[PDB]
Design a protein around this ligand. Structure first.
Ligand SMILES: C[C@H](OP(=O)(O)OC[C@@H](O)[C@@H](O)[C@@H](O)Cn1c2nc(=O)[nH]c(=O)c-2cc2ccc(O)cc21)C(=O)N[C@@H](CCC(=O)N[C@@H](CCC(=O)N[C@@H](CCC(=O)O)C(=O)O)C(=O)O)C(=O)O
Ligand SMILES: C[C@H](OP(=O)(O)OC[C@@H](O)[C@@H](O)[C@@H](O)Cn1c2nc(=O)[nH]c(=O)c-2cc2ccc(O)cc21)C(=O)N[C@@H](CCC(=O)N[C@@H](CCC(=O)O)C(=O)O)C(=O)O
Lengths: 140, 140
């Protein structure tokens, strides 16, 4: 009662990430965090979203978890509509194309994500909604 | 003169800016440079555009001119359609609302811009078309 909401923390972390040029706000419980920029599905405004860092050979994966909620985070719809995103990993920023993965291809990235953030597994057991995963490829 | 083509240079400067987290690529002939993020008017894709830094009390101005050429840079149309932009000044990134300015209000910012980059004045004498200027106001 009177404490900030999980959404307030997320906003604050994003802000710190931006103000600091990727030097602060890059961690959550000692695990690395990236900053995603998406284009609003409806408004066309830039939205900043801290997410866990899941990386393999220059590609990143992002997970639309929101704890184990019934409904996807709003940013999920931004990525689907506008797959050109920006991902900042510490001081390094790049543009990427995002592609939702399914089945066996997803299970690969899902395992890599759980290795970074074990709670993802627990999130999935809390809900029948299949937690989306996108794979991000640098533009070349 | 062994200069790179203006497109290639722009891409490269933007890239350096992004890779370095605003620590490199922030200068052009000893004058400061910002990195503008816009949403494509038609595609909805993120575009990164290095521009001269023109600043006053937390607001920025940006000037739309490739030399004194007949047609506006294409990013001009992105800002008109999608006035919510991002501006990176060195390590600092923020969200801004952009509005095109005219008459007396423009002349104020035009003076500040010429102080930073005198060539702007010369660009305007090469064309009857009035070189656009936007004023960017922080939001959030
Ligand atoms: C070719 C095009 O680039 P541009 O026209 O944005 O280039 C303008 C240049 O000014 C920039 O490269 C700029 O970075 C250069 N520059 C500077 N330029 C300055 O002006 N001022 C400065 O102070 C400055 C400083 C500066 C300092 C260092 C440096 O390295 C460069 C600097 C492009 O990327 N094309 C791409 C993307 C274009 C795009 O955004 N496309 C939109 C299309 C929206 C549109 O145009 N809508 C209508 C237009 C119709 C109409 O106009 O009525 C349509 O296409 O139907 C989208 O994605 O949606 C492509 O073809 O794919
Ligand atoms: C409430 C909403 O948030 P959301 O995008 O649904 O999801 C909440 C997010 O904070 C949340 O998903 C993540 O940021 C939280 N989060 C992680 N969330 C995850 O899902 N996965 C992670 O791995 C993760 C890691 C993480 C690490 C650190 C941290 O601080 C937060 C982390 C929001 O930001 N609303 C904004 C923007 C909404 C938006 O994009 N609007 C759209 C359309 C909206 C409409 O249709 O009404 C538009 O502009 O077009 C607003 O209402 O103005």
């Amino acid at each position: 009662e009177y404490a900030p909401s999980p959404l307030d923390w997320s906003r604050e972390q994003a802000d710190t990430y931006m103000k600091s040029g990727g030097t602060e706000g890059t961690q959550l419980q000692g695990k690395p965090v990236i900053l995603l920029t998406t284009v609003g599905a409806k408004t066309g405004k830039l939205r900043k979203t801290p997410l866990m860092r899941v990386e393999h050979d220059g590609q990143y994966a992002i997970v639309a978890s929101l704890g184990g909620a019934p409904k996807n985070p709003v940013w999920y719809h931004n990525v689907v509509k506008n797959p050109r995103v920006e991902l900042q990993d510490g001081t390094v920023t790049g543009d990427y194309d995002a592609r939702e993965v399914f089945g066996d291809e997803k299970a690969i990235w899902w395992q890599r994500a759980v290795a970074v953030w074990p709670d993802y597994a627990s999130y999935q057991t809390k809900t029948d909604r299949q937690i989306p995963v996108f794979v991000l490829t640098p533009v070349r």
